[PDB]
Design a protein around this nucleic acid. Structure first.
Ligand code: K
Ligand code: MG
Length: 106
RNA sequence: GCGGCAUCAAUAUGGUGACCUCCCGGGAGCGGGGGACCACCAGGUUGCCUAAGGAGGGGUGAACCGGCCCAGGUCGGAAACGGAGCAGGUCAAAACUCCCGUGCUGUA
């Protein structure tokens, strides 16, 4: 439950524009074009998740130093005790697929 | 060796590299492992109604387009470390180009 134990979401995980080795985490059929951390958190937060922005972190695998291309997003799943904060997001993978599907909407 | 033209394919085994798609593990950088597909390679067969199909020797690789190894610096990290990768070094294997040889064909 300690922020230090929040999981990580780098936009690169979600970027349909990046190869596996550039860091893509979800299938292109679900991936998305150039999502930004902000977005990522902006969807998560408004789902009842606990999540904050590290606007300044920078994914390793990302030579470009442009902003649109940076920031990390921290999301708490389980409750210090051990329960997920929302039955619907067990896996980090679950989060990723969700974020990936709601952003197209904002 | 004067001028012309033209020079494999498909099979097995073991590399190299991309890419896609799934799990398991993790607070990052990540660890673990299953499939699919492409390109290139090694040297071993196989073959066609080849005119011949050696699987030859070089060079470029460079303002991102190659593979490796990567000083620095940079990003993740409390650190250990790890990633991405420039310079430089380097090469059985991105791609593009040079030398041959070799086979048929040739006519004044
Ligand atoms: K160091
Ligand atoms: Mg695999």
């Amino acid at each position: 439950a300690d922020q230090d134990r929040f999981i990580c979401i780098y936009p690169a995980y979600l970027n349909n524009k990046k190869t596996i080795a550039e860091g893509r985490r979800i299938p292109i059929s679900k991936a998305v074009e150039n999502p930004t951390a902000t977005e990522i958190q902006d969807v998560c937060s408004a789902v009842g998740l606990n999540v904050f922005l590290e606007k300044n972190k920078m994914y390793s695998r990302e030579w470009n130093r442009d902003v649109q291309y940076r920031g990390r997003v921290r999301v708490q799943l389980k409750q210090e005790d051990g329960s997920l904060c929302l039955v619907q997001f067990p896996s980090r993978k679950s989060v990723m697929l969700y974020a990936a599907e709601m952003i197209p909407k904002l």
